[PDB]
Design an enzyme around this catalytic site. Structure first.
Site, mmCIF file in Angstrom:
data_model
loop_
_atom_site.group_PDB
_atom_site.id
_atom_site.type_symbol
_atom_site.label_atom_id
_atom_site.label_comp_id
_atom_site.label_asym_id
_atom_site.label_seq_id
_atom_site.Cartn_x
_atom_site.Cartn_y
_atom_site.Cartn_z
ATOM 1 N N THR A 101 -4.112 6.222 9.901
ATOM 2 C CA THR A 101 -5.038 6.305 8.794
ATOM 3 C C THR A 101 -5.153 5.101 7.851
ATOM 4 O O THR A 101 -5.696 5.223 6.755
ATOM 5 C CB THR A 101 -4.681 7.530 7.972
ATOM 6 O OG1 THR A 101 -3.459 7.122 7.306
ATOM 7 C CG2 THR A 101 -4.540 8.848 8.758
ATOM 8 N N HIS A 106 6.741 7.000 5.596
ATOM 9 C CA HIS A 106 6.122 6.604 4.335
ATOM 10 C C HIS A 106 5.392 7.796 3.806
ATOM 11 O O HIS A 106 5.118 8.732 4.570
ATOM 12 C CB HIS A 106 5.069 5.537 4.455
ATOM 13 C CG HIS A 106 4.179 5.648 5.699
ATOM 14 N ND1 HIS A 106 4.544 5.094 6.833
ATOM 15 C CD2 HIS A 106 2.991 6.311 5.928
ATOM 16 C CE1 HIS A 106 3.663 5.385 7.739
ATOM 17 N NE2 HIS A 106 2.709 6.133 7.216
ATOM 18 N N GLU A 141 -3.495 13.463 2.977
ATOM 19 C CA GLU A 141 -4.547 12.903 3.798
ATOM 20 C C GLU A 141 -5.273 14.070 4.503
ATOM 21 O O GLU A 141 -6.470 14.307 4.375
ATOM 22 C CB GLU A 141 -3.885 11.930 4.779
ATOM 23 C CG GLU A 141 -3.315 10.740 4.031
ATOM 24 C CD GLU A 141 -3.551 9.464 4.802
ATOM 25 O OE1 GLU A 141 -2.952 9.227 5.848
ATOM 26 O OE2 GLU A 141 -4.366 8.692 4.336
ATOM 27 N N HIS A 153 4.781 10.879 6.530
ATOM 28 C CA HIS A 153 4.451 10.599 7.898
ATOM 29 C C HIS A 153 5.643 9.889 8.523
ATOM 30 O O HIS A 153 5.958 8.769 8.061
ATOM 31 C CB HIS A 153 3.236 9.672 8.017
ATOM 32 C CG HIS A 153 1.946 10.215 7.451
ATOM 33 N ND1 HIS A 153 1.049 9.647 6.626
ATOM 34 C CD2 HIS A 153 1.465 11.442 7.796
ATOM 35 C CE1 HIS A 153 0.026 10.487 6.518
ATOM 36 N NE2 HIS A 153 0.302 11.531 7.208
ATOM 37 N N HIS A 174 0.789 -1.206 0.000
ATOM 38 C CA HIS A 174 0.000 0.000 0.000
ATOM 39 C C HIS A 174 0.822 1.256 0.000
ATOM 40 O O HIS A 174 0.297 2.317 -0.323
ATOM 41 C CB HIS A 174 -0.971 -0.015 1.171
ATOM 42 C CG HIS A 174 -0.419 -0.485 2.481
ATOM 43 N ND1 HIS A 174 -0.231 -1.749 2.863
ATOM 44 C CD2 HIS A 174 -0.049 0.350 3.498
ATOM 45 C CE1 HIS A 174 0.237 -1.724 4.080
ATOM 46 N NE2 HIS A 174 0.344 -0.461 4.454
ATOM 47 N N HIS A 214 1.964 9.177 1.134
ATOM 48 C CA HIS A 214 0.637 8.931 0.576
ATOM 49 C C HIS A 214 0.653 9.889 -0.582
ATOM 50 O O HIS A 214 1.080 11.020 -0.309
ATOM 51 C CB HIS A 214 -0.541 9.374 1.474
ATOM 52 C CG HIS A 214 -0.554 8.567 2.734
ATOM 53 N ND1 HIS A 214 -1.285 7.517 3.008
ATOM 54 C CD2 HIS A 214 0.324 8.744 3.747
ATOM 55 C CE1 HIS A 214 -0.859 7.041 4.138
ATOM 56 N NE2 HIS A 214 0.144 7.759 4.616
HETATM 57 C C1 LIG Z 1 3.237 0.166 11.779
HETATM 58 C C2 LIG Z 1 2.649 1.529 11.420
HETATM 59 O O1 LIG Z 1 3.416 2.491 11.374
HETATM 60 N N1 LIG Z 1 1.325 1.603 11.161
HETATM 61 C C3 LIG Z 1 0.784 2.747 10.826
HETATM 62 N N2 LIG Z 1 -0.474 2.686 10.560
HETATM 63 N N3 LIG Z 1 -0.893 3.902 10.092
HETATM 64 C C4 LIG Z 1 0.080 4.765 10.058
HETATM 65 S S1 LIG Z 1 -0.249 6.378 9.396
HETATM 66 N N4 LIG Z 1 -1.449 6.244 8.335
HETATM 67 O O2 LIG Z 1 -0.872 7.002 10.563
HETATM 68 O O3 LIG Z 1 0.788 7.433 9.205
HETATM 69 S S2 LIG Z 1 1.589 4.239 10.605
HETATM 70 ZN ZN LIG Z 2 0.491 7.382 6.714
#
Ligand SMILES: CC(=O)Nc1nnc(S(N)(=O)=O)s1
Ligand SMILES: [Zn+2]
Ligand SMILES: [Hg+2]
Length: 255
Positions: free
Chosen positions: A194, A90, A102, A115, A60, A92
């Site tokens: 998220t 990572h 987001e 993030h 993802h 988005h």
């Molecule tokens: C293992 C991990 O990091 N899981 C996460 N799940 N959502 C995240 S996010 N969308 O908040 O930045 S990080």
């Molecule tokens: Zn994220």
């Protein structure tokens, strides 16, 4: 779950009913209802002894992972009580440059969002931290399309190594400081992860100042694939969760 018609955000509630809970992220930041709180301390981003380990496409998005076995890269200060360890970062992004983020700022959407995830060291490991309302803190950074981000290029180049789901590539000596904007002015609020499990455990800290990356740098993001190797090609684009109802919450600003 995924970001498609049949398994997208508007369906995650069936396996993850917390999708329509109390403190879900992301949200629209209305700058005029944001409460300037002058008791909010400055952010203390200590990322000079960071050990990056690898990058991996998890189906993802891609995650640069870090060695959180010792306080090497930590976040404290701001709204946080205690030390939060960097585990991974990572993005988005969207299929076009007018979508991607987001969180939005007065309903405005930027090209993507970084993030940097951190877990509170009081809890021993990330696993126990998501059993807690203050378990995590995610530093969020908006990307806009302009001039190229020097420090983003090592990440961009490795992406051919990890085009498909499940792939990884050793990725050591990456310094996350190269992605931080000039100003550490943030907005903060109680929220959630998220992506499923959507756990309501995150203190979000969204910076006001976007970084810019170039159009060719973000194009490379859109070449990755959702799909595994030897499967039909599903381009990893638009992997973002739509804004959620703020429900009670007030967003504070350090400015
Ligand atoms: C293992 C991990 O990091 N899981 C996460 N799940 N959502 C995240 S996010 N969308 O908040 O930045 S990080
Ligand atoms: Zn994220
Ligand atoms: Hg939690």
């Amino acid at each position: 779950w995924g970001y498609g018609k049949h398994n997208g955000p508007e369906h995650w509630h069936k396996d993850f009913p917390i999708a329509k809970g109390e403190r879900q992220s992301p949200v629209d930041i209305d700058t005029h209802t944001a409460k300037y709180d002058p008791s909010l301390k400055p952010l203390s981003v200590s990322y000079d002894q960071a050990t990056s380990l690898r990058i991996l496409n998890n189906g993802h998005a891609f995650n640069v992972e870090f060695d959180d076995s010792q306080d090497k890269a930590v976040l404290k200060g701001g709204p946080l009580d205690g030390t939060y360890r960097l585990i991974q970062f990572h993005f988005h992004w969207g299929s076009l440059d007018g979508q991607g983020s987001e969180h939005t700022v007065d309903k405005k959407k930027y090209a993507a969002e970084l993030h940097l995830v951190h877990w509170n060291t009081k809890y021993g490991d990330f696993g126990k931290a998501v059993q807690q309302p203050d378990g995590l803190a995610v530093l969020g950074i908006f990307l806009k399309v302009g001039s190229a981000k020097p420090g983003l290029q090592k990440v961009v180049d490795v992406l051919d190594s990890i085009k498909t789901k499940g792939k990884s590539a050793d990725f050591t000596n990456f310094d996350p400081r190269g992605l931080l904007p000039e100003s550490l002015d943030y907005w903060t609020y109680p929220g959630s992860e998220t992506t499923p499990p959507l756990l309501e455990c995150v203190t979000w800290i969204v910076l006001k100042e976007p970084i810019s990356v170039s159009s060719e740098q973000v194009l490379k993001f859109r070449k990755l694939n959702f799909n595994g190797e030897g499967e039909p090609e599903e381009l990893m684009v638009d992997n973002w969760r739509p804004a959620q109802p703020l429900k009670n919450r007030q967003i504070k600003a350090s400015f």
